[PDB]
Design an enzyme around this catalytic site. Structure first.
Site, PDB file in Angstrom:
ATOM      1  N   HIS A   1     -17.945   6.252  11.098  1.00  0.00           N
ATOM      2  CA  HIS A   1     -19.833   5.652  10.464  1.00  0.00           C
ATOM      3  C   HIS A   1     -20.525   5.947  12.213  1.00  0.00           C
ATOM      4  O   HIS A   1     -19.942   6.784  13.025  1.00  0.00           O
ATOM      5  CB  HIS A   1     -19.498   4.918   9.948  1.00  0.00           C
TER       6      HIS A   1
ATOM      7  N   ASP B   1     -10.145  -1.813  -1.482  1.00  0.00           N
ATOM      8  CA  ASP B   1      -7.998  -0.788  -1.914  1.00  0.00           C
ATOM      9  C   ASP B   1      -8.930  -0.021  -0.475  1.00  0.00           C
ATOM     10  O   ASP B   1      -9.818   0.740  -0.237  1.00  0.00           O
ATOM     11  CB  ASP B   1      -9.379   0.324  -2.606  1.00  0.00           C
TER      12      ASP B   1
ATOM     13  N   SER C   1      -6.863  -4.296  -2.694  1.00  0.00           N
ATOM     14  CA  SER C   1      -5.400  -3.091  -3.617  1.00  0.00           C
ATOM     15  C   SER C   1      -4.407  -3.718  -3.940  1.00  0.00           C
ATOM     16  O   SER C   1      -3.570  -3.684  -4.849  1.00  0.00           O
ATOM     17  CB  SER C   1      -5.854  -1.874  -2.667  1.00  0.00           C
ATOM     18  N   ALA C   2      -4.057  -4.011  -2.251  1.00  0.00           N
ATOM     19  CA  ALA C   2      -2.562  -4.913  -2.141  1.00  0.00           C
ATOM     20  C   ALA C   2      -2.294  -6.336  -3.058  1.00  0.00           C
ATOM     21  O   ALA C   2      -1.472  -6.084  -3.538  1.00  0.00           O
ATOM     22  CB  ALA C   2      -2.747  -5.247  -0.577  1.00  0.00           C
TER      23      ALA C   2
END
Lengths: 251, 251
Positions: free
Chosen positions: B230, B144, B117-118
């Site tokens: 999770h 992302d 993303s970055a």
């Protein structure tokens, strides 16, 4: 007139400077003078740290050596060059703050405000502030380095300004650089009866055959040439500069 | 929206970048990819560094160890975050240079481009270029992080961006930051029939009750959810994200 990219880099550093924490007379900010030396001299030599990228109290080090045993030397710093230090929001603020530190940390006992040039305007601004406040200095001392030629002097200046767009400084100082530069540069000095001494410690007594001869400090003042080359022990004409400041203070 | 000072700080950082040495396509500039790990996979995972103030091959260390013993993982650097590296004059410049590196050392042997993303835009930029030169990637992987909803995610970004205005990088990185921000900012990613896998790995599997749900990646693309909470052993969310990329490729 070739390096106008210096103006830009500076104009930008200043811009970044506005994000830093600023201070004015309002907020209780204050700072301390640094003790460089002591001597019996009835007059204290308060020195102002230039605004050059380097600068700071350390610059008057050699001058304090020359004055130790001759007169009390104390330096004023320029807030913002050292980690987490605020930046004056105006020439008006900084002179005021410093002004305070002097009336306070000096009480009575006369003093002279002096600077190297990279600190000449700040030195003179402080000088003004003191005068308006009612605690004028015995005088102002401008220890002009740089050469006598208009160019060569103008050159040398940009010359070393680039050396900071060339193993380099840090954020804190580069911003302050852009900040104070913005300040002094925009500030307009006015007359103040204050007697003044202009010490010309630049290289080559007179300018090269290319006839330049830079502009000199306007406002009444006395002068003394103090080069840097000759015959007894080629090292520090700091003592030469020093003694001169003294013999000046005593007629 | 209050923090619009950032838009400015960046511009300033950007303008400063212009004083650095740049590079476009012509000049035989070049760079090397970094090997991060390797395995039997017939597909190589070529990850792009983000343009964040941090960013660099290192940000791909977890995902690498997660693929160690699975597939080879090479990383592409964004030129200019490290000392002395020139800056891309344009988005096209940096892609070609990186594209070269990729085709030069990979030959055949498939590969995927993966961003964080970055680095999403850079990854896709690099994927466009690579496809345009005849060596298209098997697909793109846009990981992302950040929250799922429009706001929050908008805060998470703007809120960490300020974390770099509070513990502070170096001129090379901050300049380089404004430099690329300036770039991707004006880059208009056109389509591409490239198989894309979006990996919504941000926390909050869904946006907080107070409406949000951010605009997703346009263009065709598959999807996967891998939040930040999770049932196994809390730490390598990577092992998860990783194995998905691998399964994605195998069908």
């Amino acid at each position: 007139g070739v390096s106008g990219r210096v103006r830009s880099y500076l104009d930008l550093l200043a811009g970044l400077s506005d994000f830093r924490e600023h201070f004015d007379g309002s907020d209780g900010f204050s700072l301390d003078l640094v003790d460089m030396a002591d001597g019996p001299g009835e007059v204290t030599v308060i020195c102002c740290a230039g605004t050059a990228a380097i600068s700071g109290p350390h610059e008057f080090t050699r001058l304090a050596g020359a004055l130790r045993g001759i007169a009390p030397v104390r330096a004023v710093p320029q807030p913002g060059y050292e980690e987490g230090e605020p930046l004056p929001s105006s020439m008006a603020a900084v002179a005021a703050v410093q002004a305070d530190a002097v009336i306070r940390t000096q009480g009575d006992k006369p003093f002279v405000v002096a600077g190297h040039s990279a600190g000449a305007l700040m030195a003179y601004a402080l000088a003004t502030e003191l005068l308006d406040r009612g605690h004028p200095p015995r005088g102002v001392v401008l220890i002009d380095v740089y050469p006598p030629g208009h160019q060569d002097a103008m050159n040398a200046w940009l010359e070393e300004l680039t050396a900071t767009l060339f193993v380099r400084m840090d954020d804190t100082r580069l911003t302050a650089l852009g900040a104070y530069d913005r300040l002094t540069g925009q500030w307009r000095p006015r007359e103040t009866g204050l007697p003044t001494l202009l010490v010309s410690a630049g290289e080559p007594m007179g300018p090269w055959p290319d006839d330049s001869w830079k502009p000199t400090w306007p406002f009444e003042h006395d002068t003394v040439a103090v080069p840097g080359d000759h015959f007894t022990m080629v090292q520090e004409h700091a003592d030469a500069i020093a003694r001169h400041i003294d013999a000046w203070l005593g007629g």
